[PDB]
């Protein structure tokens, strides 16, 4: 159980084999997630707020054949992330697998209107740069 504070934190449970519970609290927090092979070992993010927080998914994305390398620009990265990161209300998946379990204080309404729809997006970090990926369904 790894808890931030009211500022802008960076939270990480480790490149481990165990469930951690991650809570960002106020502020715009980055949750760094590890890729596991056992989907039962993935972390819980208790309070992801899509209008503020972000997910660093580099570790889940880098081992996909053809992932963008050191010479990629932000349009190539955007195209890759669009194809590979599936964002829905309460879920984020890579390769059909959940990156994390999102807990009951999460909110995927990034824009503050219409609840959660395809107009909403999440902030995804790949190689220390940030991208907005829309809800796709
Ligand atoms: Ca915080
Ligand atoms: Ca841990
Ligand atoms: Ca963990
Ligand atoms: Ca937060
Ligand atoms: Ca807030
Ligand atoms: Ca995995
Ligand atoms: Ca470079
Ligand atoms: Ca919305």
**Binding-site residue ranges for Ca(2+):** 5, 7, 9, 13, 16, 18, 20, 24-27, 29, 35-36, 43, 52-53, 70, 109, 111, 113, 115, 120
Residue 124 CA, ligand 7 centroid: distance in Å: 18
Q: Could you tell me the resolution of this structure in angstroms?
A: 1.4
Residues present in the chain in total: 137
Q: How many domains does the chain have?
A: 1
Provide the residue range defining the domain that includes 129.
Answer: 1-137
Q: What are phi and psi of 127, to 5 degrees?
A: 50, 50
From which experimental method does this structure derive?
X-ray
In the chain, which residues are followed by a C-to-N distance beyond 2.5 Å, i.e. a gap?
none
């Amino acid at each position: 159980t790894l808890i931030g504070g009211q500022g802008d934190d960076v939270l990480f449970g480790g490149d481990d084999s165990l469930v951690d519970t991650l809570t960002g609290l106020e502020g715009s927090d980055i949750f760094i997630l590890n890729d596991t092979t056992d989907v039962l070992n993935i972390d819980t993010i208790t309070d992801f707020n899509a209008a503020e927080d972000a997910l660093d998914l580099t570790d889940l994305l880098t081992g996909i054949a053809g992932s963008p390398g050191k010479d990629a620009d932000v349009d190539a990265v955007t195209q890759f992330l669009t194809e590979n990161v599936k964002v829905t209300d309460g879920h984020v998946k890579v390769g059909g697998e959940d990156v994390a379990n999102f807990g009951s204080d999460s909110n995927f309404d990034s824009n503050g209107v219409d609840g959660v729809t395809t107009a909403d997006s999440i902030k995804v970090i790949y190689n220390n740069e940030e991208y907005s990926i829309n809800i796709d369904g």
